[PDB]
Amino acid sequence: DSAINVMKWKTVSTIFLVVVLYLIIGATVFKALEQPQEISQRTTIVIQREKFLRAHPCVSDQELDELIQQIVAAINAGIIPLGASSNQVSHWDLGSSFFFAGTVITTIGFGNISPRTEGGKIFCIIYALLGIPLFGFLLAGVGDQLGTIFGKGIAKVEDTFIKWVSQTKIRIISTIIFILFGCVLFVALPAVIFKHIEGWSALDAIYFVVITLTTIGFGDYVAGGSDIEYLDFYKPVVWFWILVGLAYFAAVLSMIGDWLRVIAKKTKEAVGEFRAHAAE
Amino acid sequence: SDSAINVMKWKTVSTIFLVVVLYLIIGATVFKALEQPQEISQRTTIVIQREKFLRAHPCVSDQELDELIQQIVAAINAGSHWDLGSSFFFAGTVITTIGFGNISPRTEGGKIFCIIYALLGIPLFGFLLAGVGDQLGTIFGKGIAKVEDTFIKWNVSQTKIRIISTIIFILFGCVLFVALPAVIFKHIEGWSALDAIYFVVITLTTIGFGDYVAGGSDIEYLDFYKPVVWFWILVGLAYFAAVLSMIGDWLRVIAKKTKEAVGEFRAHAAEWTANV
Ligand SMILES: CS(=O)(=O)Nc1ccc(C(=O)NCc2ccc(Cl)cc2Cl)cc1
Ligand SMILES: CS(=O)(=O)Nc1ccc(C(=O)NCc2ccc(Cl)cc2Cl)cc1
Ligand SMILES: CCCCCCCCCCCCCCCC
Ligand SMILES: CCCCCCCCCCCCCCCC
Ligand SMILES: CCCCCCCCCCCCCCCC
Ligand SMILES: CCCCCCCCCCCC
Ligand SMILES: CCCCCCCCCCCC
Ligand SMILES: CCCCCCCCCCCC
Ligand SMILES: CCCCCCCCCCCC
Ligand SMILES: CCCCCCCCCCC
Ligand SMILES: CCCCCCCCCCC
Ligand SMILES: CCCCCCCCCCC
Ligand SMILES: CCCCCCCCCC
Ligand SMILES: CCCCCCCC
Ligand SMILES: CCCCCCCC
Ligand SMILES: CCCCC
Ligand SMILES: CCCCC
Ligand SMILES: CCCCC
Ligand SMILES: [K+]
Ligand SMILES: [K+]
Ligand SMILES: [K+]
Ligand SMILES: [K+]
Ligand SMILES: [K+]
C-alpha cells in the first residue's frame, strides 16, 4: 500500500514544482506586459489630479482624497452619482438577480454585482454550496447530450472517409473536427455577435468568451453588463450559450489535460535518453 | 432500440434543467428581496453626499463635479498592481479559475497571453489539485482507520457509523479549512467574522467575486502571511472539491428518495380512488 503512495507523493511534488515554476514565468510575463501601462496611467492620473488640486484651493484638499474614497467605495455596489443622470436602473431587479444566481452556481462569478447585505452573503454561501453541485449535474447532462449529437455526426463522417484507413489515426481527424466546429459555434460566432451587440473589440470578445467559459470570470467584461438597449432575444440566447459553451470548454480543457499527460510521458522518457547518451 | 435510451436520457436532462431553472428563480427572488433595499438606501444616501459636497464646499461648481467623476471612472479601469508578487497572485487567479479580477489585464498582449496561460494552466493546475486531493484523502484514510477501530468494538455497529465518519470529515474539515483561516483573516484583514467566512466560501468554491481578497488591501503583511494563504488555497480547494462532490451525492440520494415518495403518493391516491 505504501509502495504506490511513495511513488504518488513523488509525482505530486514534481507537478507542484512545475506549477510553482509555471506561476513564476507567468508572473514575469504579465508584469512585463502590464507594469508599463500601469505606470504611464499612474503618472498621467497624478497630472490630472494636480490640475484640480491647485485649480480649486478652497477645497480642503485632504478631503479630495477622501471624496474619491467615498466614490470608489460606493462604485463597487454600482453607482451613477451624476446630476445629468440622477434617475437610475436597478442592479438587483428581476433579471439581474437571476444573472447573479447564474454567476454563483456556474462559479463564473463575474462580481460586477455581489451581495452587500449580511443576509445576501449568508444566502449566497448556502445558495452556492447547494447550487454548484446541482448545476454540475445539469452541465453533465448537457455534456452528454451534446456528446451524442457529435457521436451521430462522426458516424456519418467516419463512413464516407473510409478509403483505401486506420482505427487509431481517424481518431486524430475526429478531434480536429471537434475543435474546428466547436471553436466556430462556441467561440467565434458568439464573439462576433458580442462584438456587434456590446461594441467590444474582436479581441475583447474572444477574451470575454474564454474568461467566461473557463469559469475564471474576472468580470472586466460582462455580456448584458451595460444599459444599452438589448433585444431580449439576446440575453436568453447568452444563457443557452453559457450552458452549452461551458460543456464545450469542459471537454476542451479536459483534452488539453490529456495532451499534457502525453507530452509529460514523452518528455519524461526523452530526459532519460538525454541523460544516458551524455556523449551526444 | 438506440433512440429508446436517448429519449430516456433527454427526459433526465430536461427535468434537471427545469430544477436548475427553478433553482435560479427562487434564488433570483431571494437575492432581490435581500439586496434591492440596500441598493435604494445607498442610492438615496449617495445623492445626499453628492449635493452635500456642493454646499459644504461652494468653491466647486456643479459642472466640474461631473468631470471629476468621469476621471475617477476612467481610473477604476486601472486602479503597484503588477509588481513581482501581484502578477504571481494574478497567475494564481487564472489557473485556479477563482479569478477575483481586482487585477486583470488591460494590454491586448496581456489578454492574449491570459487566454493562452489559462488554457494550458487550468488543466496543469488540475493535476496538482488532484494530487493534493489524493494525498489529503489518504491522510484522512489513516485518520479514520484509527477512529473506526476505537468506536467499532462496542456500541451500535455498521452501516450507521459511515454517517458519523462523514460528520467528522465535515466537522474537522470546516475547522481546518474554513473556521481557522477565517479567524486569521478576520484579524489580519480587519474583515468581519461573516465577511471572512463569506470570503473563504466564495474563494474556495472558485466563484471568486473579488469583493474581498486576502492580501488585497495596502496593509503591512507579515512575510509569512501570503504564502500561508497560497498553501490554504491549494489544500482548501481540494477540500471543497470533495465537499461539493459529497453534496452532489446527497442530491442524487434525495432525488431518488423524492422520486419514489411521489411514486408512493401517486400509488395511494390510486387505490384510494378505486375505492368507490
Ligand atoms: C451589470 S447588471 O447585473 O446590472 N446587468 C445584467 C448583466 C448581465 C445579464 C445576463 O443575463 N447576461 C447573460 C449571462 C447569463 C448568465 C450567466 Cl452565468 C452569465 C451571463 Cl454573461 C443580465 C443583467
Ligand atoms: C491589488 S494587488 O494585486 O496588489 N493585491 C493582491 C492580492 C492578493 C495577493 C496574494 O498573493 N493573495 C493570496 C492568494 C494567493 C493566490 C490566490 Cl489564487 C489567491 C489569493 Cl487570495 C497579492 C496582491
Ligand atoms: C479569429 C481567431 C479565433 C481563434 C479562436 C481561439 C481558439 C481557442 C480554442 C483552443 C484550441 C485551439 C487549437 C489550436 C492548436 C494549436
Ligand atoms: C482583430 C484582432 C483579432 C485577434 C485574434 C488573435 C487571437 C489569437 C488566440 C491565440 C490562441 C492560441 C491557442 C493555443 C492553444 C494552446
Ligand atoms: C507560459 C509558458 C510556460 C512553460 C512551462 C515551463 C516548462 C517547464 C519544463 C519543466 C521540465 C521539468 C523536467 C523534469 C523531467 C523529469
Ligand atoms: C446543436 C447544438 C446547439 C448549437 C446552437 C448554437 C448556439 C450559439 C449561441 C450563440 C449566441 C451568442
Ligand atoms: C506554447 C507553450 C507550451 C508550454 C508546454 C508545457 C509543457 C509542460 C510539460 C510538463 C512536464 C512534467
Ligand atoms: C531546463 C531544461 C529544458 C529541457 C527542454 C525540453 C523541452 C521539452 C519539449 C518536449 C517536446 C517533445
Ligand atoms: C427547489 C426545490 C423544489 C422541489 C422540486 C420537486 C421536483 C419534483 C419532481 C420529482 C420527480 C418525479
Ligand atoms: C431580460 C432578462 C433575461 C432573462 C432570460 C430568462 C430565460 C432563461 C431561459 C434559458 C434558456
Ligand atoms: C503577444 C505576446 C506573446 C508572448 C509569448 C510568450 C511565449 C513564452 C514561451 C516560453 C517557452
Ligand atoms: C457567522 C454565521 C455564518 C452561518 C453560515 C451558515 C452555513 C450553513 C451551511 C448549510 C449548507
Ligand atoms: C434544498 C432542496 C434541494 C432539492 C433538490 C431535489 C431534486 C429533485 C429531483 C427530482
Ligand atoms: C432524442 C432527443 C430529443 C432532442 C430534442 C432537440 C434537441 C437536439
Ligand atoms: C493544517 C491547517 C492549515 C490551515 C492554514 C490556515 C491559514 C490561513
Ligand atoms: C439575516 C437574514 C438571514 C436570511 C437567510
Ligand atoms: C459537483 C457535482 C457534479 C456531479 C457530476
Ligand atoms: C459580419 C462581420 C464579420 C466580422 C469578421
Ligand atoms: K470576479
Ligand atoms: K470569478
Ligand atoms: K470557477
Ligand atoms: K471548476
Ligand atoms: K470564478
From Swiss-Prot, chain A:
K(+) 1 binds at residues 107-108, 215-216. Glycans are attached at residue 84. K(+) 3 binds at residues 109-110, 217-218. Residues 1-11 are annotated as: Important for GNG4 binding and L-glutamate release in astrocytes. Residues 107-112 are annotated as: Selectivity filter 1. The keyword rRNA processing does not apply. One of its GO terms (cellular component) is node of Ranvier. Disruption phenotype: Double KCNK2 and KCNK10 knockout mice suffer from chronic basal allodynia which can be partially reversed by treatment with topiramate, a drug used to treat chronic migrane. The keyword Cytoplasm does not apply. Detected in hippocampus astrocytes (at protein level). Detected in dorsal root ganglia (DRG) neurons (at protein level). High expression in brain and lung. Also detected in kidney, heart and skeletal muscle. Not detected in liver. In the brain, highest expression in olfactory bulb, hippocampus and cerebellum. Residues 143-171 are cytoplasmic. Activated by various stimuli including intracellular acidic pH, mechanical stretch and polyunsaturated fatty acids such as arachidonic acid. Activated by volatile general anesthetics such as chloroform, diethyl ether, halothane and isoflurane. Activated by arylsulfonamide ML335 and thiophene-carboxamide ML402 compounds. Inhibited by extracellular acidification. Inhibited by antidepressant metabolite fluoxetine (Prozac). Inhibited by barium. Not sensitive to polycationic dye ruthenium red. Residues 94-120, 202-232 dip into the membrane without crossing it. The record marks 91 as: pH sensor. The chain crosses the membrane at residues 12-32, 122-142, 172-192, 237-257. Residues 262-275 are annotated as: Interaction with AKAP5. K(+) 2 binds at residues 108-109, 216-217. Each subunit contributes two pore-forming domains 1 and 2 which assemble to form a single pore with M2 and M4 transmembrane helices lining the central cavity and M1 and M3 facing the lipid bilayer. The transmembrane helices are bridged by the selectivity filters 1 and 2 carrying a signature sequence TxTTxGYGD that coordinate the permeant ions. Up to four ions can simultaneously occupy the selectivity filter and at least two elementary charges must translocate across the filter to convert it into the open conformation. Homodimer; disulfide-linked. Heterodimer with KCNK1; disulfide-linked. Heterodimer with KCNK4. Heterodimer with KCNK10. Heterodimer with KCNK18. Interacts with AKAP5; the channel is recruited to postsynaptic microdomains by AKAP5 where it can integrate neurotransmitter receptor signals. Part of a complex composed of AKAP5 and ADRB2. Upon AKAP5 binding, the channel is no longer sensitive to intracellular acidification, membrane stretch or arachidonic acid stimuli. Interacts with POPDC1; the interaction enhances KCNK2 surface expression and is inhibited by cAMP. Belongs to the two pore domain potassium channel (TC 1.A.1.8) family. This is Potassium channel subfamily K member 2. The lineage of its organism: Eukaryota, Metazoa, Chordata, Craniata, Vertebrata. The gene is Kcnk2.
From Swiss-Prot, chain B:
GO terms for molecular function: identical protein binding; ligand-gated channel activity; mechanosensitive potassium channel activity; metal ion binding; outward rectifier potassium channel activity; potassium ion leak channel activity; protein heterodimerization activity; voltage-gated potassium channel activity. Residues 133-162 are cytoplasmic. Residues 253-266 are annotated as: Interaction with AKAP5. It is found in: Cell projection, Axon; Cell membrane, Sarcolemma. Residues 206-211 are annotated as: Selectivity filter 2. Each subunit contributes two pore-forming domains 1 and 2 which assemble to form a single pore with M2 and M4 transmembrane helices lining the central cavity and M1 and M3 facing the lipid bilayer. The transmembrane helices are bridged by the selectivity filters 1 and 2 carrying a signature sequence TxTTxGYGD that coordinate the permeant ions. Up to four ions can simultaneously occupy the selectivity filter and at least two elementary charges must translocate across the filter to convert it into the open conformation. This is Potassium channel subfamily K member 2. The lineage of its organism: Eukaryota, Metazoa, Chordata, Craniata, Vertebrata. The gene is Kcnk2. The chain holds residues 50 to 336 of 426 of the full protein.
